[PDB]
UniProtKB/Swiss-Prot annotation, chains A, B:
This is Regulatory protein SdiA. It comes from Escherichia coli (strain K12). SMART domains: HTH_LUXR. PANTHER family: DNA-BINDING TRANSCRIPTIONAL ACTIVATOR DEVR_DOSR. Residues 193-212 bind DNA. Activates cell division by specifically increasing transcription from one of the two promoters that lie immediately upstream of the ftsQAZ gene cluster. Activates ydiV expression in response to extracellular autoinducer AI-1 (Vibrio fischeri autoinducer oxoC6). Residues 169-234 form the HTH luxR-type domain. Binding to the autoinducer occurs via the N-terminal 170 residues; as E.coli does not produce LuxI autoinducers endogenously it should be able to bind to a number of different AI-1 autoinducers, which would enable it to detect other bacteria. This was shown to be the case. PROSITE patterns: HTH_LUXR_1, HTH_LUXR_2. It comes from the Bacteria. The gene is sdiA. One of its GO terms (biological process) is cell division.
Length: 236, 236
């Protein structure tokens, strides 16, 4: 019964107090669905220029280390939201036609089958939950059931990890005052210091004071980086 | 059976060819759940300074017109994601303690009960689907069922409307070239024209050429507004 399954899982992820409890539960759930491995990968919205990818997996260390050394991240189709439908992606051979080194390496080490579910988080990070299996044998599972179950697992695990302030999911902290945020908003709209001073009935010195403090807080070189980081993560 | 309900609804929203077909189906679904009214509201990510709110409802015109004239949008708690749990919000009296003019106006015109479901879209717009009822009488409905059904309805209606390029959900168009986007990314990271010229092995003239074309395309006063709009909507 899905309604009861769902009821239990929300409560289990609600009550978790550590990252390892989240990872252990995902491992157990993968196992119940008859999967050998999981990986949880998060493409952060920033830096814009080389976005951070953070992960946690039970794949053997040699495989992860190999995936990293071959730069399979650049070709990995399982981490591209454009090829998901309804947040869901059952792996097939066609998926890997532009990622043949990855497909060959994976099949040579014993991987046969897998599935990925994804979600965009409130901070605009993209979370991907993959399950994989070394067995090519048909397991009977309702497509709808698997989809809905992984929908919850990817959301709750990453919501728990967000609540637990985990490095895998957290974007740079921008503890900005109300007034700083207000000035930032006018900045993002293309207003100059002079125009913002008129809008808010303050001096340019005051505007630039606030700009400077926000730059200082996050170690930014200018207001553009502050506004863009704020805009990207939804702080603004 | 939820699995079959879900199967039919995905197909119905997939096959829709107009906005009215989407709205008509939401109206019918509200009615099946025993609701009198629906409203579909979308808080756009931009402009940052007065974010656009676009809506479609079957509420009487006099009510909408009244809600607008009283500026109930400023106090409306049903459109604040901070008070949702799992994207879901069953209306209660406590919800409106800081929105008493709205609650009094609504109850005086005959509203008694309602529910809201929300979703953040790929473009960072926030979509809210509300159902409401003039009857205070207990309807028997499984909380889990109602939650999961509205989860699909809010997603599919707004995904259909995104596919149909509807004004309710679409953010400003930024048809930017690969090279324009690349320069934009370095801009959002805090790089100057000179630094970008060195990074990409081009002249400052070339960099500024591209900046200008992007400014011209969307009618922006400077690169900051272009980068922030791009960053906010996820174009970057
Ligand atoms: Cl989709
Ligand atoms: Cl095979
Ligand atoms: Cl939540
Ligand atoms: Cl009552």
């Amino acid at each position: 019964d899905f309604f009861s399954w769902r009821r239990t899982m929300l409560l289990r992820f609600q009550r978790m107090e550590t990252a390892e409890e989240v990872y252990h539960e995902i491992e157990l759930q993968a196992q119940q669905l008859e999967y050998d491995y999981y990986s949880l990968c998060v493409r952060h919205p920033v830096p814009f220029t080389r976005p951070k990818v953070a992960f946690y997996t039970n794949y053997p260390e040699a495989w992860v280390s190999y995936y990293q050394a071959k730069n399979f991240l650049a070709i990995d189709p399982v981490l591209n939201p454009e090829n998901f439908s309804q947040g869901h992606l059952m792996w097939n051979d066609d998926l890997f036609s532009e990622a043949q080194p990855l497909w060959e390496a994976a099949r040579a080490h014993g991987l046969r089958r897998g599935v990925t579910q994804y979600l965009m988080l409130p901070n605009r990070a993209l979370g991907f939950l993959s399950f994989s299996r070394c067995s090519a044998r048909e397991i009977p599972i309702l497509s709808d059931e698997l989809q809905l179950k992984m929908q919850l697992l990817v959301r709750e695990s990453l919501m728990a990890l967000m609540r637990l302030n985990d490095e895998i999911v957290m974007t740079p902290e921008m503890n900005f005052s109300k007034r700083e945020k207000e000035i930032l908003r006018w900045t993002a709209e293309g207003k100059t210091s002079a125009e913002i001073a008129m809008i808010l009935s303050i001096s340019e010195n005051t505007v630039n004071f606030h700009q400077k403090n926000m730059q200082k807080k996050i170690n930014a070189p200018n207001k553009t980086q502050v506004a863009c980081y704020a805009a990207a993560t939804g702080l603004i």
